[PDB]
Nucleic acid binder design. Structure first.
Lengths: 93, 97, 78, 103, 97, 81, 108, 93
DNA sequence: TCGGATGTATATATCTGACACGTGCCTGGAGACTAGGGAGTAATCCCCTTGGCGGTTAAAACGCGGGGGACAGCGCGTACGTGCGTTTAAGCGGTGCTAGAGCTGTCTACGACCAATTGAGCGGCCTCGGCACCGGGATTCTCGA
DNA sequence: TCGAGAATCCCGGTGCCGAGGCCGCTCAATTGGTCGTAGACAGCTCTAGCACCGCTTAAACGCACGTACGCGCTGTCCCCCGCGTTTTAACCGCCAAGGGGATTACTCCCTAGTCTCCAGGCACGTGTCAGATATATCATCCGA
């Protein structure tokens, strides 16, 4: 058993382009991009939690890591989507 | 007869190798070079195919980026022909030297 | 002698993809030197990972990690 | 029931929580951190895929290949800045000939 | 009447500012510029003196490395006077443009 | 408020920085080029410094915020902190 | 319970081994930390510190100075090839620059 | 509160290297920043090495490999020789 | 600047091997419930950052020769493209086969954890010695002759 | 070459502030046990890395040939440097205050840990069509 993001990357692709497909090499590249970004944000959040003598990664740390990592418009949109998702998650129990 | 004037074919092959995504380097010579270089670190090393391929894709991208910087360094000196001093300047400024 | 397997036309093709119009003669050796240095640097760390893993084969993941260590992240192999 | 459907996302919130817990990042991991990270990852994936689909369509092709990903990444100012130090295998380069070389 | 020739009073002060370890930038103007720049990110900030000093040290180290690369680029073009195009080329090759 | 303090990086300061960099002769546009390079560098560093400050719920930018912001861009200032 | 012997003196080192064990355990590096890892890391850190202090003291002696200042650390790091390679993306505060005038600029 | 610094040990190393050479507070702070930076660099490399091989512990061999990866040329060849020589002395109580 | 002639797009038959889709099952993700410790909220202290005024004067801004270097134009000869003939080795498609990469089952030694115990190192206080500063003399470079 | 003149080094004397040692005392490193489990070790499998071999042919190599471009030389001029004079605002000192960065106290609620249940996504197999390839049919560029 090996875990990849192929199913989710393919679902997102069907959302944004319902009439296009993705090759195997492109799926491998997308998995490597998702893993790289996950590792970057998680490491930045871990360092942020370490600097403040806290031992918990929260939405605050992930949001600040996103703001530190991604450029201006990309960071603003990512923060907006993350906040919206966290709000929806919380209200719907 | 129709000798394409000096410089015009050189203008081509750029539009050819920037459109393509192939490797541009022979693969067996590169595998032999990789193995010869790796002999100096450990004897009787076996290489995975996806490892020689990864090394080739990384090294060719590195060389293409270096040549892109080198061309700028050569245009800076009001020249068109790249000389090795252009490569050394690019490497020195980038931090490699 | 395997560094001569990186022929003059291969360097010329890499230059053409890099946007180069004219190439001097000494480039075909100044480029082999750089390629050999880069390959030695990458393969040193790849073999270091291989030896630490108690393995005798250099997997693509070792090369990917060695490149990611030098700042040249590579997508497509893991 | 899945936390990805509860938050309206497609990436796995459970898998992201597991990776955050087993990744040696912090002693304990909050409850909304996986949701936030999954949302951010899904947003970035959607941006990349929507930009690559345009490049695939501009080539009269109904399939995304590494060349299209490279075009989409290098033609966007911010994606190229987030992935400046990344090499895409089989992605080629961006067509760019300097004006000095032209006749 | 004894006027130094244009190519000496300038290597002098090159030796001087390479021998020393000072800051070479006035401190109040730099602090004021830092505060002006930081107003765009959060209103009513209170910089700590050590932070303003670290900013100055880092900025001048960056500006000295950049001027070294600019000097190298200007010498590459068979020149002595550094031009803004030299700075542009240095930053482009460095990966800052 | 504060405006147009980039001219506080005077021409002699830029010439002294160039002299330490090893530059023997300077043009006349290098000053304006440098006053725009330095502003970009300072904005890039201070954005991350203020982000680190705001995350910690503080109102003062400590030297550790600047050090972490510099280390984020791969510059690793030794000394303070 | 016998006489207390510090782990850094049993290994012969000068850098602390208990402190390095504590920092490796409270640093979130791995779930568990081996017994010899702090000893190895303390020995490596002590060697690297001694290597820089040798050249820094040499530079201070060449300048007829009893004490070591950041200028001497910078002179030691930039002159030595391997220390310069290790610390090539590092800015030493109050260190200045290494005196290097290009040959072209010198007068004829 | 009590801030911990490598001042005592760095001074001990200085006095065993240069018996009659002092050190200023700023140079001591730079040495502390260097020691912390190298500690965290080697520790992060060792953590990544342990993670890559699906291990759950940082032993002396991960530190050896991290030193080999991080220190250049002749510096690593000497640091490995000090680490092994110290570990050997440690495990002969 | 159009005539001849190259080297790209454009249009169509023809595979074929990756792509997207059933499937089933088993491992990882939900769901409930409990314990406890991280941290969020309150209140306080003091320190250190902001703000201000006066006096010095070091430094920036200014203005003026003037020389030297950047720029442009000419010319030359060489070395780098362009094309043609060859020959050299790269692909490719099979073969065999064997090192060793990967996965499983014990079980043993090692690392976490906890409960006293204490000494190493952190904090506060001198203080005298190394270093900065100035004043003057000796030494070294420099540039118009 | 040569000597007046400016810049710099040396040598000494004086002051001053911080580097270093000493004392007190916490609290974090040491010692000694138990206990759980991570991985060391042996073993088996199967797979993919290696070696070889024939064949085709694409690419590399060598050699004329020429032309255009890199490099050196010469002339202009303009613009940057060295220097003297005049502001001017940095800088040091010394004061006052209050904002908020560090602390402790308490408690509460959020997350880890565990047991139980179930569904989704990961190998596995299969039709099938998107696109690559062979073949024929207009932008540009080289020469009077």
């Amino acid at each position: 058993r090996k875990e990849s993001y192929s199913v989710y990357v393919y679902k997102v692709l069907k959302q944004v382009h319902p009439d296009t497909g993705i090759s195997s090499k492109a799926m491998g590249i997308m998995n490597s991009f998702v893993n790289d970004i996950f590792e970057r944000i998680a490491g930045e959040a871990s360092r942020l939690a370490h600097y403040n003598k806290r031992s918990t990664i929260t939405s605050r740390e992930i949001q600040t890591a996103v703001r530190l990592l991604l450029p201006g418009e990309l960071a603003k949109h990512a923060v907006s989507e993350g906040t919206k998702a966290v709000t929806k998650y919380t209200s719907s129990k | 007869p129709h000798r394409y004037r000096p410089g015009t074919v050189a203008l081509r092959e750029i539009r050819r190798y920037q459109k393509s995504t192939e490797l541009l380097i022979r693969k067996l010579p590169f595998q032999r070079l990789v193995r010869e270089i790796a002999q100096d670190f450990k004897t009787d090393l076996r290489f995975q195919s996806s490892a020689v391929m990864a090394l080739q894709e990384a090294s060719e991208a590195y060389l293409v980026g270096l040549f892109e910087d080198t061309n700028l360094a050569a245009i800076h000196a009001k020249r068109v022909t790249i000389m090795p001093k252009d490569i050394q300047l690019a490497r020195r400024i980038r931090g490699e030297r | 002698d395997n560094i001569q397997g990186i022929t003059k036309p291969a360097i010329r093709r890499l230059a053409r993809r890099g946007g180069v119009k004219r190439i001097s003669g000494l480039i075909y050796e100044e480029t082999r030197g750089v390629l050999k240095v880069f390959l030695e640097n990458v393969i040193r760390d790849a073999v270091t990972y291989t030896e630490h893993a108690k393995r005798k084969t250099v997997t693509a993941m070792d090369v990917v990690y060695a490149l990611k260590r030098q700042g040249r992240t590579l997508y497509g192999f893991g | 029931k899945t936390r990805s459907s509860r938050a309206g996302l497609q990436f796995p919130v459970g898998r992201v929580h597991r990776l955050l817990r087993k990744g040696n990042y912090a002693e304990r991991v909050g409850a909304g951190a996986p949701v936030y990270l999954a949302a951010v990852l899904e947003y970035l994936t959607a941006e990349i895929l929507e930009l690559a689909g345009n490049a695939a369509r501009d080539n009269k092709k109904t399939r995304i290949i590494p060349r299209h990903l490279q075009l989409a990444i290098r033609n966007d100012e911010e994606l190229n800045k987030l992935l400046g130090k990344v090499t895409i295998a089989q992605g080629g380069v961006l067509p760019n000939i300097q004006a000095v070389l032209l006749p």
